[PDB]
């Protein structure tokens, strides 16, 4: 394929290489086809490569999910309908039950494999979406960051910007925390950290005058928003710094597609994100888990209407260019 990486704001969401999933309340994410995603996601994580069977060994791979009913050829055309819409497509390494335990050494193996998916699929970069127990098992922390050094010189000398990005889980990203080699060894590779606000029942942050300030608490969601990314983007409040035009904030599309973190009120977003703007740190934009969730339906079969993207995609892509 053709590398296509993102210069703007993005609205980044994961598509789901499976069918009919059951949502925290009961709802029905559907596979979907790429060219049914809203085009306002200008990012789509194709979700997820892993290692499928210990019989092939360690470095895990891509294979698009038969069920699906979209041929290989077919996928791969839809791929280049996005790019030819400027949009990105990524692939995600990671996910739950995902079997990622490499051992040192194998980062040669793994960035030809991402090269080979790359070239054949027309992927334009790789997001890091570890599930919990991979963030430190065996030599991850050393092997995924040396392997994807790899795939970025490979890229650019050939004047392509492979785009990196990870999705940490929030309480990770204390100064120290477990997923800060990633960042500290991807300092200048990756292209913008997209963390998952959601999923962490009640952790969060103290702040003098507010008080404690928790990812799950909806009547102080946009101080928890303004406060969280604030503490980030300067690296504050024993947070890792991700400086604002690289740091995307990552939220369940709805209550089905994560167990805590949906934003009830969108407002309380806009109003965070502008006041970020305010001290001149606007953020890169939104991510979201997952366009299949926003495409879903509720335990009622009601359709959830693509209501995630009508509220931020104008919103986020009517911001001004990144700097
Ligand atoms: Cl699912
Ligand atoms: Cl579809
Ligand atoms: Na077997
Ligand atoms: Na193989
Ligand atoms: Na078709
Ligand atoms: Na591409
Ligand atoms: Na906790
Ligand atoms: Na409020
Ligand atoms: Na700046
Ligand atoms: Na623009």
Same mark, same amino acid.
């Given at each position: 394929?053709?590398?296509?990486?993102?210069?703007?704001?993005?609205?980044?969401?994961?598509?789901?290489?499976?069918?009919?999933?059951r949502g925290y309340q009961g709802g029905n994410?559907?596979?979907?086809?790429?060219?049914?995603?809203?085009?306002?996601?200008?990012?789509?994580?194709?979700?997820?490569?892993?290692?499928?069977?210990?019989?092939?060994?360690?470095?895990?791979?891509?294979?698009?999910?038969?069920?699906?009913?979209?041929?290989?050829?077919?996928?791969?055309?839809?791929?280049?309908?996005?790019?030819?819409?400027?949009?990105?497509?990524?692939?995600?390494?990671?996910?739950?039950?995902?079997?990622?335990?490499?051992?040192?050494?194998?980062? &040669?193996?793994?960035?030809?494999? @991402?090269?080979?998916?790359?070239?054949?699929? *027309?992927? =334009? +970069? $790789?997001? !890091?979406?570890?599930?919990?127990?991979?963030?430190?098992?065996?030599?991850?922390?050393?092997?995924?960051?040396?392997?994807?050094?790899?795939?970025?010189?490979?890229?650019?000398?050939?004047?392509?910007?492979?785009?990196?990005?990870?999705?940490?889980?929030?309480?990770?990203?204390?100064?120290?925390?477990?997923?800060?080699?990633?960042?500290?060894?991807? &300092?200048?590779?990756?292209?913008? @950290?997209?963390?998952?606000?959601?999923?962490? *029942?009640? =952790? +969060? $942050?103290? !702040?003098?005058?507010?008080?404690?300030?928790?990812?799950?608490?909806?009547?102080?969601?946009?101080?928890?928003?303004?406060?969280?990314?604030?503490?980030?983007?300067?690296?504050?409040?024993?947070?890792?710094?991700?400086?604002?035009?690289?740091?995307?904030?990552?939220?369940?599309?709805?209550?089905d597609?994560?167990?805590?973190?949906?934003?009830?009120?969108?407002?309380?977003?806009?109003?965070?994100?502008?006041?970020?703007?305010?001290? *001149?740190?606007?953020?890169?934009?939104?991510?979201?888990?997952?366009?299949?969730?926003?495409?879903?339906?509720d335990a009622?079969?009601?359709?959830?209407?693509?209501?995630?993207?009508?509220?931020?995609?104008?919103?986020?892509?009517?911001?001004?260019?990144?700097?």
């Amino acid at each position: 394929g053709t590398i296509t990486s993102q210069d703007d704001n993005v609205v980044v969401g994961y598509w789901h290489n499976w069918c009919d999933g059951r949502g925290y309340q009961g709802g029905n994410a559907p596979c979907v086809e790429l060219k049914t995603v809203n085009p306002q996601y200008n990012v789509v994580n194709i979700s997820f490569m892993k290692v499928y069977d210990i019989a092939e060994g360690r470095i895990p791979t891509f294979k698009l999910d038969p069920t699906i009913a979209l041929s290989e050829a077919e996928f791969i055309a839809q791929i280049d309908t996005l790019n030819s819409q400027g949009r990105s497509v990524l692939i995600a390494l990671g996910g739950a039950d995902a079997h990622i335990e490499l051992t040192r050494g194998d980062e &040669d193996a793994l960035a030809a494999e @991402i090269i080979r998916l790359t070239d054949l699929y *027309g992927f =334009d +970069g $790789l997001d !890091i979406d570890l599930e919990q127990a991979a963030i430190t098992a065996k030599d991850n922390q050393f092997v995924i960051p040396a392997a994807l050094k790899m795939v970025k010189e490979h890229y650019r000398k050939t004047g392509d910007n492979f785009m990196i990005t990870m999705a940490p889980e929030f309480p990770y990203l204390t100064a120290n925390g477990a997923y800060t080699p990633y960042l500290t060894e991807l &300092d200048g590779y990756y292209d913008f @950290i997209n963390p998952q606000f959601y999923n962490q *029942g009640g =952790d +969060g $942050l103290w !702040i003098e005058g507010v008080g404690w300030i928790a990812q799950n608490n909806d009547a102080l969601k946009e101080e928890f928003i303004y406060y969280i990314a604030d503490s980030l983007i300067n690296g504050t409040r024993n947070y890792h710094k991700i400086p604002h035009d690289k740091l995307v904030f990552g939220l369940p599309s709805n209550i089905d597609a994560a167990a805590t973190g949906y934003i009830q009120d969108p407002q309380d977003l806009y109003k965070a994100f502008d006041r970020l703007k305010a001290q *001149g740190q606007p953020l890169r934009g939104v991510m979201t888990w997952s366009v299949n969730w926003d495409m879903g339906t509720d335990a009622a079969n009601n359709s959830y209407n693509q209501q995630f993207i009508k509220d931020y995609g104008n919103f986020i892509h009517n911001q001004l260019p990144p700097v």
